Every structure is written in C-alpha cells, then in structure tokens.
GROMACS .gro file of C-alpha atoms in nm:
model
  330
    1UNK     CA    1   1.565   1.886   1.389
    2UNK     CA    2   1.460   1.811   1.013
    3UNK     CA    3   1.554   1.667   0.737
    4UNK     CA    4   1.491   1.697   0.339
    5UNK     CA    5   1.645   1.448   0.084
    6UNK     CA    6   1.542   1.432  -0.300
    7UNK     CA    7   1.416   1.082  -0.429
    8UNK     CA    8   1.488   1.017  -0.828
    9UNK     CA    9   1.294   0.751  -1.039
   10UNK     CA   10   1.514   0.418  -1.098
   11UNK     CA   11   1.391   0.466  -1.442
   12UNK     CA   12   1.171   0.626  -1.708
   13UNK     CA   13   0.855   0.441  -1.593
   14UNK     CA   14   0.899   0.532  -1.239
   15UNK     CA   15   0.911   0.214  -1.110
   16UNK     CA   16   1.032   0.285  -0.778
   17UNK     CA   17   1.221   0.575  -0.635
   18UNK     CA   18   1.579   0.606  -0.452
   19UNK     CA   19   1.682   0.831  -0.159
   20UNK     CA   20   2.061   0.867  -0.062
   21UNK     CA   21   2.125   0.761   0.272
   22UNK     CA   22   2.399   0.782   0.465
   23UNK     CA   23   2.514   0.482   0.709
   24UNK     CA   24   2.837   0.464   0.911
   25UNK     CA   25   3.125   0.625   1.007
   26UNK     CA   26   3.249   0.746   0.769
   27UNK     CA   27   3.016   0.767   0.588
   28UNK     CA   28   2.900   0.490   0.351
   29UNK     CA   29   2.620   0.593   0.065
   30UNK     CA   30   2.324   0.397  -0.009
   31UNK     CA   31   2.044   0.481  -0.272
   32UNK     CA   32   1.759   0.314  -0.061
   33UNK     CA   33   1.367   0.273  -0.158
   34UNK     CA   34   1.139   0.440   0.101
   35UNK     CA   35   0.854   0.219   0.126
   36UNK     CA   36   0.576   0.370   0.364
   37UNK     CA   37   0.428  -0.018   0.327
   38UNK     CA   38   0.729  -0.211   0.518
   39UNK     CA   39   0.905  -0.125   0.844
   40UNK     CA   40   1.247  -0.316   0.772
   41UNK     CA   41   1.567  -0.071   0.682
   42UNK     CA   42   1.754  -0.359   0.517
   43UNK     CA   43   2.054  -0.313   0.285
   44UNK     CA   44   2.239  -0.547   0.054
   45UNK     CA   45   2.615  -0.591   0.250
   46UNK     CA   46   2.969  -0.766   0.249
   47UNK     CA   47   2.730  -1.051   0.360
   48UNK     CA   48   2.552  -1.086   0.121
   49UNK     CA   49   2.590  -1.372  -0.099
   50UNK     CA   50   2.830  -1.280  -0.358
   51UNK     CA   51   2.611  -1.481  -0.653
   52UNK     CA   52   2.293  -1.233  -0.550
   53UNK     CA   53   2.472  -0.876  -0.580
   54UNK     CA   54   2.486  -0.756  -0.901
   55UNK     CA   55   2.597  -0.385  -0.946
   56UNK     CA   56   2.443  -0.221  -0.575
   57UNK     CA   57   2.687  -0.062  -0.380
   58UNK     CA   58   2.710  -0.230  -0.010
   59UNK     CA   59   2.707  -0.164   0.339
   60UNK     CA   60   3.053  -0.311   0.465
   61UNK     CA   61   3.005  -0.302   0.883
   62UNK     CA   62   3.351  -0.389   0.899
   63UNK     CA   63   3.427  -0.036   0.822
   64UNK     CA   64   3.231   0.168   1.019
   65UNK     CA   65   3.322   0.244   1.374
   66UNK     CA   66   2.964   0.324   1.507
   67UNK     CA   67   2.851  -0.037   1.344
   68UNK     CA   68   2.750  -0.223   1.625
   69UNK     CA   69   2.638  -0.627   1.594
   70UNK     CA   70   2.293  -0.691   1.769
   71UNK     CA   71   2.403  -1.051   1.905
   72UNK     CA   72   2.169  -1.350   1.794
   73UNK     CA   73   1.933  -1.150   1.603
   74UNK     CA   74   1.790  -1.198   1.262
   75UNK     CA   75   1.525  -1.062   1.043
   76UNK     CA   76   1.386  -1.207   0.708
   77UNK     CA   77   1.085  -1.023   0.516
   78UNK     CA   78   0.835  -1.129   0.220
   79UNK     CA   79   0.681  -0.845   0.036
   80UNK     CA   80   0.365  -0.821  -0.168
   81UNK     CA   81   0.510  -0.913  -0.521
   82UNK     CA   82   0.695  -1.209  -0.370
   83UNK     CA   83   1.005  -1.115  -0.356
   84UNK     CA   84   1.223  -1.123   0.032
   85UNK     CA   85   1.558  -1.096   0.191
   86UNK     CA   86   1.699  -1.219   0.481
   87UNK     CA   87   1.996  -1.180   0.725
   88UNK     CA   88   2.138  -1.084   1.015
   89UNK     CA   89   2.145  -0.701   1.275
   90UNK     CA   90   2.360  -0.381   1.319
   91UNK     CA   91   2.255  -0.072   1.481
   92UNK     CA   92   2.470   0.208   1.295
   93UNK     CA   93   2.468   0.580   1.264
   94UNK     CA   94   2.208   0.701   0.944
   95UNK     CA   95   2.138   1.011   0.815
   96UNK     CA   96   1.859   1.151   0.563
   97UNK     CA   97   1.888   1.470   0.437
   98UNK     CA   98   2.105   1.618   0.701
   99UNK     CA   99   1.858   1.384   1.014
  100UNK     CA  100   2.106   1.155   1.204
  101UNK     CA  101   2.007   0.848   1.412
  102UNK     CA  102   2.219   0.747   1.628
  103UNK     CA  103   2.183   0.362   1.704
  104UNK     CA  104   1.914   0.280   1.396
  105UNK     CA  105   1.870  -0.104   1.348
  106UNK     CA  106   2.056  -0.158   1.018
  107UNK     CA  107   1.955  -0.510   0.856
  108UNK     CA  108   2.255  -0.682   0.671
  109UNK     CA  109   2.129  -0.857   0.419
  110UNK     CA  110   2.288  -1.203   0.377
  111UNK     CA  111   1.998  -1.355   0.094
  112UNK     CA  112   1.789  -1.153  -0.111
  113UNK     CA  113   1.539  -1.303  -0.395
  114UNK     CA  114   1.630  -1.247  -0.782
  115UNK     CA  115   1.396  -0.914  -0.811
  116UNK     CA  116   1.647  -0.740  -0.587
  117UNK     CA  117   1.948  -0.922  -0.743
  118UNK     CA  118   1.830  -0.813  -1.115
  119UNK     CA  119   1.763  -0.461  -0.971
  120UNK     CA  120   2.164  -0.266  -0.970
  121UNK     CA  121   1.974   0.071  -0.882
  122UNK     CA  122   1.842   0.002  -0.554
  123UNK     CA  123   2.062  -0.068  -0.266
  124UNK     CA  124   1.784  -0.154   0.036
  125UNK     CA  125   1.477  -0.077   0.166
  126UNK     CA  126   1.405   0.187   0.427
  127UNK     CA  127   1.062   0.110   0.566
  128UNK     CA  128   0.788   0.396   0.668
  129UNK     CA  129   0.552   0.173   0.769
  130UNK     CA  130   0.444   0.133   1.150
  131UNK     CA  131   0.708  -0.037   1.375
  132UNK     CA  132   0.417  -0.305   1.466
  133UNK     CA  133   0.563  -0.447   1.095
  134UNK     CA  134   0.915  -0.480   1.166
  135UNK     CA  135   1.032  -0.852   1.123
  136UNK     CA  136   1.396  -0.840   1.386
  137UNK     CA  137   1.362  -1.142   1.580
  138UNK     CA  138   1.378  -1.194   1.875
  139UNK     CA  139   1.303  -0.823   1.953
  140UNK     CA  140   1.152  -0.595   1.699
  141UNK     CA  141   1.349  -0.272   1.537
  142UNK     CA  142   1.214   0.052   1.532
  143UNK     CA  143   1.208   0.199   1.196
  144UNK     CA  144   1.442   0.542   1.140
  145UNK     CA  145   1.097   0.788   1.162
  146UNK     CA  146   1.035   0.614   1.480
  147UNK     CA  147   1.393   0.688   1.599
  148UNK     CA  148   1.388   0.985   1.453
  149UNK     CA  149   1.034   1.143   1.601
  150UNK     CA  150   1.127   1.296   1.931
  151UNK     CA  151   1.370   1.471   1.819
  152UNK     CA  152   1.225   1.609   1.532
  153UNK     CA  153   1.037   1.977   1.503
  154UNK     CA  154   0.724   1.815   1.404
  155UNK     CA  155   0.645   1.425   1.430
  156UNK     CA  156   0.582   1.413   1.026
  157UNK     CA  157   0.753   1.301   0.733
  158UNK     CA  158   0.614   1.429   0.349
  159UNK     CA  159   0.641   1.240   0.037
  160UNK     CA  160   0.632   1.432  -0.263
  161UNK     CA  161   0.674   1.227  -0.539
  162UNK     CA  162   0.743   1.333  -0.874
  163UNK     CA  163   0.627   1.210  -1.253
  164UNK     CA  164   0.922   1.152  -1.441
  165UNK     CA  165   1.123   1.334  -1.253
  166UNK     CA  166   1.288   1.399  -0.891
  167UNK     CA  167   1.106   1.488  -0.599
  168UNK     CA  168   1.128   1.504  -0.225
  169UNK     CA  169   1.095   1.320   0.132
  170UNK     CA  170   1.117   1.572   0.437
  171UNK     CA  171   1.116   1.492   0.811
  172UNK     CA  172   1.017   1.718   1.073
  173UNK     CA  173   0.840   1.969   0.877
  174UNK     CA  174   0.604   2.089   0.572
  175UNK     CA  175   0.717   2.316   0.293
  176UNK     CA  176   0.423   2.507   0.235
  177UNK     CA  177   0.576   2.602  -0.091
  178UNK     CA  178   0.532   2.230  -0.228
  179UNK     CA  179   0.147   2.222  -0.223
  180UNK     CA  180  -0.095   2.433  -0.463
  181UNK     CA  181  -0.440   2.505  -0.222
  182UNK     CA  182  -0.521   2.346   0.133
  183UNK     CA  183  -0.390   1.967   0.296
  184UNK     CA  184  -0.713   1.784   0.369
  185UNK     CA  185  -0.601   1.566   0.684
  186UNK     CA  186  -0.814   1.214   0.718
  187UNK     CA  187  -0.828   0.939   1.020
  188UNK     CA  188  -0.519   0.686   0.985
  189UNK     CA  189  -0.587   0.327   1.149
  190UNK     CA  190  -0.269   0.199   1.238
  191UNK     CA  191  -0.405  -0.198   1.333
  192UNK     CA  192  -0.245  -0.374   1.037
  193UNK     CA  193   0.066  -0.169   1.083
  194UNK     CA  194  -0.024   0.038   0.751
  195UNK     CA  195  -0.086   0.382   0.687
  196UNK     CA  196  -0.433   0.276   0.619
  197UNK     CA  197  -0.724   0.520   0.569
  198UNK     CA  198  -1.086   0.583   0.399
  199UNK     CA  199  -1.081   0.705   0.062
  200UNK     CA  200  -1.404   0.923  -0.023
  201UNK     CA  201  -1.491   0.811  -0.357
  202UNK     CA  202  -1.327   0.819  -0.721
  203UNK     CA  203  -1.402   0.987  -1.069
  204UNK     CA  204  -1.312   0.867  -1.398
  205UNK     CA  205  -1.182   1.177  -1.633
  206UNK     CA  206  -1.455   1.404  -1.688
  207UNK     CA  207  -1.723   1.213  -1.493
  208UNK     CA  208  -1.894   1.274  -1.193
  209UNK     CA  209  -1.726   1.170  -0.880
  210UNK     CA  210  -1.888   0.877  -0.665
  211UNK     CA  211  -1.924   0.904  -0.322
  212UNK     CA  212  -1.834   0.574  -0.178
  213UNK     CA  213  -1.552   0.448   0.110
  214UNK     CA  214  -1.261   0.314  -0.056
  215UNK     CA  215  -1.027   0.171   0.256
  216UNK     CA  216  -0.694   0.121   0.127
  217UNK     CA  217  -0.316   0.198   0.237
  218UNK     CA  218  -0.029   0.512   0.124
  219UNK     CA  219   0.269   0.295  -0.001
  220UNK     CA  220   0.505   0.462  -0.173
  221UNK     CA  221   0.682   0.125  -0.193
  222UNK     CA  222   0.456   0.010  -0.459
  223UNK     CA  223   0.427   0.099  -0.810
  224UNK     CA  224   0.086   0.117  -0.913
  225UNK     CA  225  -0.255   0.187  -0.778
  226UNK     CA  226  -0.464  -0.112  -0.679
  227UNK     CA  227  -0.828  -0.067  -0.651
  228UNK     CA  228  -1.163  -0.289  -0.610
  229UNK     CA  229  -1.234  -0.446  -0.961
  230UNK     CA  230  -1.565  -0.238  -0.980
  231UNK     CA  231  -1.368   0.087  -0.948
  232UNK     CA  232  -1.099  -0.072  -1.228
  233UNK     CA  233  -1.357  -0.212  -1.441
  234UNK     CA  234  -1.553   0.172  -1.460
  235UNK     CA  235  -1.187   0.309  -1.537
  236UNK     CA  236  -1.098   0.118  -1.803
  237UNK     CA  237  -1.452   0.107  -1.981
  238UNK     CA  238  -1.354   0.435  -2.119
  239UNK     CA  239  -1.060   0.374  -2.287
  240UNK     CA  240  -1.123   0.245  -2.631
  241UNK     CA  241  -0.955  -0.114  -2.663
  242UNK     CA  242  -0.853  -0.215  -2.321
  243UNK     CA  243  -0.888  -0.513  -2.209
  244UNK     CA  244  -0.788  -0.719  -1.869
  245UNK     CA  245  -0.512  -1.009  -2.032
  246UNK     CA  246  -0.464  -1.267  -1.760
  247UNK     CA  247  -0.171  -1.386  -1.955
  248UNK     CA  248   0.017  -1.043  -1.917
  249UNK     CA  249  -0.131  -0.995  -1.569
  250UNK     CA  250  -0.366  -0.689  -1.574
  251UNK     CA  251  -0.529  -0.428  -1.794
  252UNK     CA  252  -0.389  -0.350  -2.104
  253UNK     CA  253  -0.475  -0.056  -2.365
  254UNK     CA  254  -0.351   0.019  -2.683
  255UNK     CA  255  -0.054   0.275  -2.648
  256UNK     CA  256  -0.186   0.515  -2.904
  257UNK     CA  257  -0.478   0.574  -2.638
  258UNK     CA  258  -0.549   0.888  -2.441
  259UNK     CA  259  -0.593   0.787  -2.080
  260UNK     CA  260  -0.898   1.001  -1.849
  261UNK     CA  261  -0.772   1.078  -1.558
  262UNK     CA  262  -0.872   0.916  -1.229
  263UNK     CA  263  -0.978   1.131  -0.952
  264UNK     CA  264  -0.999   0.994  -0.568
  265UNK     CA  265  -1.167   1.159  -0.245
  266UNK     CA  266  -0.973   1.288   0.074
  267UNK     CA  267  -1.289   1.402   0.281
  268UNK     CA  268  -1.462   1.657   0.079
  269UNK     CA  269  -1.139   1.713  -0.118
  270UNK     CA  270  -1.034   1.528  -0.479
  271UNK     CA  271  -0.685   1.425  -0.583
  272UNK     CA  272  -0.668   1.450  -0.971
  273UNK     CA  273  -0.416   1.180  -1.149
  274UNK     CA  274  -0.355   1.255  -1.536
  275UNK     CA  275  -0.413   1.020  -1.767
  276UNK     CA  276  -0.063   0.998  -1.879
  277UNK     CA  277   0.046   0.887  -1.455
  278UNK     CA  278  -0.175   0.567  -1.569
  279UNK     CA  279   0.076   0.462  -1.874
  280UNK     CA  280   0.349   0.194  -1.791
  281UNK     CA  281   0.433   0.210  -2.151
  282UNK     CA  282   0.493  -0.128  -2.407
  283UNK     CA  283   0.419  -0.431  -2.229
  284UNK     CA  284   0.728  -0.598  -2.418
  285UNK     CA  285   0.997  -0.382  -2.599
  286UNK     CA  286   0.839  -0.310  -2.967
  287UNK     CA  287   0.461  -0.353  -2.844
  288UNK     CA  288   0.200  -0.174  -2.932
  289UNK     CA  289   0.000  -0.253  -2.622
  290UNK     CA  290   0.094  -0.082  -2.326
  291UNK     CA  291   0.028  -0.177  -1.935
  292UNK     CA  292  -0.198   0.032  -1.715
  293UNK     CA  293  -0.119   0.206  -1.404
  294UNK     CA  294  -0.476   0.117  -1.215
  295UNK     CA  295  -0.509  -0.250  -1.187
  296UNK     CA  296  -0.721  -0.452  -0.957
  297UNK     CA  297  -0.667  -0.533  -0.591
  298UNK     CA  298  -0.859  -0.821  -0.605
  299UNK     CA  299  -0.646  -1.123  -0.469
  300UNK     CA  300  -0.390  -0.904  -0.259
  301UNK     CA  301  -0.654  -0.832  -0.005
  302UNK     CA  302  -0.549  -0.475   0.042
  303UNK     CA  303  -0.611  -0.156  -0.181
  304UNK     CA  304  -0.282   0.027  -0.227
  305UNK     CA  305  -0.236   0.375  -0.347
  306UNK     CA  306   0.095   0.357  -0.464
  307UNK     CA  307   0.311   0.553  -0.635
  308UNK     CA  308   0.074   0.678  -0.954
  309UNK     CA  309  -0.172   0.790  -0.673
  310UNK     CA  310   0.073   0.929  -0.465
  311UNK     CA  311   0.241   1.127  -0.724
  312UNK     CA  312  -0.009   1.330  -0.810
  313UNK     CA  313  -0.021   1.471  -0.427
  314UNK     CA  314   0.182   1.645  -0.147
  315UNK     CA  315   0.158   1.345   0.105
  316UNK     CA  316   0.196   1.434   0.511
  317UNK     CA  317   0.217   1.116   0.713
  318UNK     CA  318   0.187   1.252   1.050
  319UNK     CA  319   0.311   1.028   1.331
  320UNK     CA  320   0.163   1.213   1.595
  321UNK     CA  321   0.013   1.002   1.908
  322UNK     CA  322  -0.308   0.961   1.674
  323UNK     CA  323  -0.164   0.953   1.343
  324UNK     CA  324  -0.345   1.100   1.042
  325UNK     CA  325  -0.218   1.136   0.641
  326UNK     CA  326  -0.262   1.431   0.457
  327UNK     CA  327  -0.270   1.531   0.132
  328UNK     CA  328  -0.251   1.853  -0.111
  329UNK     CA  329  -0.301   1.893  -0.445
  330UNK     CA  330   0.046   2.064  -0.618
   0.00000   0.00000   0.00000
C-alpha cells in the first residue's frame, strides 16, 4: 500500500504545516501537524476542556463506531517550546492520503497549553518520530508509520515541504519526479528516539563550505533551524545590521536586508537554503526589524533542522530495520 497527502502552511510565514487526516467511522477530518520530532498522534476532542478549544474542529469518539477506549490509559507530552497536552486513549481507524490503520492509538486530548488553544488552524499532532518517544502510559503507542510499515510497498515516508506554498508527505514510496539530481542517503541513530544524523558541514551564501560534523535531528515539527552558535554567529556576520536581541529572543536583521543563503552537507552532497527561507518577517506588526530563520541551539541541547532546512529538500525517512534519512535537492 501507499499513501500521498498534501501539507499547506498555517500561514504566510510557514509556521507549521497541516495534513488532513481522516479518523473514524465515518469519517471525521482533522488538519493535523506531522512532527517527525514527537511520536504522540494526539487530537483536541469532545473532551477537551471547553475553555481551551478555540476554533479546531474535534475528534468526537462518541461517534465513531471503530473508536475503541484503551481502559486506564493516559498520555501527557511537553514539547520543546513549552507548550503540552494531556488526556486520555482510543485506538480508531486513520487514514492519510488514501493509507488506513486499522486500530492506531488516537490520544483524546482532555488539557492542552494556551499555544495550542490560541492556534484555530491546527487540530493535533501526528508524531513521526521513533515509537521509543511515545508518552501512553502504562503501555506505549505505536505511532501511525509504525502501524503502517508492514503493510506498506516500501518502509519510507517523504516530506517535501514547500516555501510558501503546499507540498507533500507520501508513505510507502518515492516520487522520483519530486527531486532535481540524486538522494544522498546518511546513517540515522535512532537512541534518543530522533531521526538524528551527522551533518557534513555548512556554507554561508557564496562562501566556501566547511567540512565539519554537525549532529542534529529532521523535525519537521519545528519551525526554524537551530544550529551551534559558531555556525549562527558566521551566518549572521554577513548580513549588514543583525544583531542577536535577547529581549526578542534571537537574531534579528533589518528587513530591507538581502539574506546569503545557508548551505549544509549530506555526505559529499550540499543542501542549498535561499536567503529569503531565513526571513520570519517583522518581529512586531509595523517593524522594521525582522526575525531570522537560523537561530542558535545553544540551551535546547539538540540541533534541529526544521522546517527552513527541510524545505529546501526532498526528505526520505526510511524506517527500514537500520533506518537512514535521505535527502535531494528539488
């Protein structure tokens, strides 16, 4: 089997990315975030505290007749920017892009923090991450590529984000079409329960790359890319007037600038993100100064290529029994 299901930006920054998903019988419709850096599939629900949904459709059990309760089971999750959620277990029927699960742990949501509240676009979280992460107590849930893996043609999902503009996750196969040149495959350790891996090295626009390792995770569940201060610090040297503002929270630049683009290493093979990727536009409505797109990891104790490095590639996570990530240029 396969599946292929287009992800849209929330918003003209892309801040994060929905995929329609399908849970239930009948069918109920969900726009969930596919985060490669969680393992949870949690939704807001009927359960969840009325005074915390504002605008997101729900997941109402009570109406599905392949919603079954997992008896005594809870989960509750804490992501990197603070925000959680919290509730209680159903397995259900769920579909992406024409894949069905049959029996996927569904978490119900019955307490979410205010970034999720404040958010009306996104509707859950459905976690790519390694099962290892899943937080169902007592007895951890596999996540829906998990499920989904036997069954499908080829034990890989893709992630092809886009810049301002739709793009796609597939499972079970790769479109050859979606990818300009060769994938460059690299080692995956799977001990933190990340998609982790060893960058090559990095450029900054024009410059000449440097070879150095750069271990760091694919999370498409995170906005920006998150880098050692050194490799931040080199960036942002050449763009006239930036500056790192502890009271906004990273590097800033004025918004007239023209960003360099940042290149990382796969193996022998370079990833090129424009300039413009880097841009997260005024850092208050009406400001001139506008918020950059590589900011430091120092502090989170993980680098994270998130979205703006993950956009500018065809991404192949490939669950095989060693996993490995690849990535194309397009």
């Amino acid at each position: 089997s396969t599946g292929s299901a287009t992800t849209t930006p929330i918003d003209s920054l892309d801040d994060a990315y929905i995929t329609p998903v399908q849970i239930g019988t009948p069918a109920q419709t969900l726009n969930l975030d596919f985060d490669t850096g969680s393992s949870d599939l949690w939704v807001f629900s009927s359960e969840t505290t009325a005074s915390e949904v504002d605008g997101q459709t729900i997941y109402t059990p009570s109406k599905s007749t392949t919603a079954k309760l997992l008896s005594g089971a809870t989960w509750s999750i804490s992501y990197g920017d603070g925000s959680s959620s919290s509730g209680d277990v159903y397995t259900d029927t769920v579909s992406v892009g024409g894949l069905t699960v049959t029996g996927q742990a569904v978490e119900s949501a019955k307490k979410v923090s205010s970034s999720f509240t404040e958010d009306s676009t996104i509707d859950g979280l459905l976690g790519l991450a390694f099962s290892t992460l899943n937080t169902v107590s007592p007895t951890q849930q596999k996540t829906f590529f998990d499920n989904a893996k036997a069954s499908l043609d080829s034990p890989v999902f893709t992630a092809d984000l886009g810049y301002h503009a739709p793009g796609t996750y597939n499972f079970g196969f790769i479109d050859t079409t979606a990818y300009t040149g060769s994938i460059t495959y690299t080692a995956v350790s799977t001990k933190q329960g990340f998609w982790e891996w060893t960058s090559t090295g990095y450029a900054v626009g024009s410059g000449t790359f440097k070879s150095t390792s750069i271990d760091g995770i694919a999370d498409t569940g995170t906005t920006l890319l998150y880098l050692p201060a050194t490799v931040v610090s080199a960036y942002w040297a050449q763009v006239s007037g930036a500056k790192s503002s502890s009271s906004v929270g990273g590097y800033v630049f004025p918004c007239s600038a023209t960003l360099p683009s940042f290149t990382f290493g796969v193996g022998s093979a370079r990833i090129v993100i424009p300039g413009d990727y880097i841009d997260f536009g005024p850092i208050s409505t009406g400001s001139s100064s506008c918020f950059g797109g590589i900011q430091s990891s120092a502090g989170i104790g993980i680098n994270i290529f998130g979205d703006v490095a993950l956009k500018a590639a065809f991404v192949v996570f490939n669950g095989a029994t060693t996993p490995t990530l690849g990535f194309a240029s397009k």
